[PDB]
Design a protein around this ligand. Structure first.
Ligand SMILES: Cc1ccc(C2(c3noc(CN(C)Cc4cnn(C)c4)n3)CCCC2)cc1
Length: 139
């Protein structure tokens, strides 16, 4: 069992620029985005997940049901739309993002007080780790 509910602060962000490059993100935006240390506010409500990734540049909001395919609007990220499914893989969430790019997806899991997120596209891998925090941020 796992529960992702919480407020999470970025600790590390490894290889994000190459991940965004593989998504054809403009190098100016790659540099802006890799400077960001976003927070994540997550509510797991049964199998209804809300993952709010919050930064001073752009936010990215996910709101989906585990196991149910949906249309994911990535206009703010790489100007694409995918047909996405997030599924349980034991205590991990496994996301497949079907679309133009091959091998696009991610895996999210918890180890202790750490939220781990590995994002992948076209064989390129970015790894992020967040720490669970308790001082809440008004948004
Ligand atoms: C050109 C651009 C790059 C990156 C972003 C942000 C971004 N950083 O990552 C994501 C969404 N995906 C790529 C990764 C992800 C986040 N949560 N999950 C489960 C997967 N947007 C950084 C803070 C939020 C907006 C926004 C715009």
């Amino acid at each position: 069992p796992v529960d992702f509910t919480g407020y999470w602060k970025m600790l590390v962000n490894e290889n994000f620029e190459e991940y965004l490059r593989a998504l054809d993100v403009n190098v100016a935006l790659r540099k802006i985005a890799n400077l960001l240390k976003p927070d994540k506010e997550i509510v797991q409500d049964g199998d209804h997940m809300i993952i709010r990734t919050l930064s001073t540049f752009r936010n990215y909001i996910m709101d989906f049901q585990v196991g149910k395919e949906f249309e994911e609007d990535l206009t703010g990220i790489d100007d694409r739309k995918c047909m996405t499914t997030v599924s349980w893989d034991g205590d991990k969430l496994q996301c497949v993002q079907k679309g133009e790019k091959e091998g696009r997806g991610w895996t999210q899991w918890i180890e202790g007080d750490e939220l781990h997120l590995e994002m992948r596209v076209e064989g390129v891998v970015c790894k992020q780790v967040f720490k669970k925090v308790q001082h809440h941020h008004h948004h």
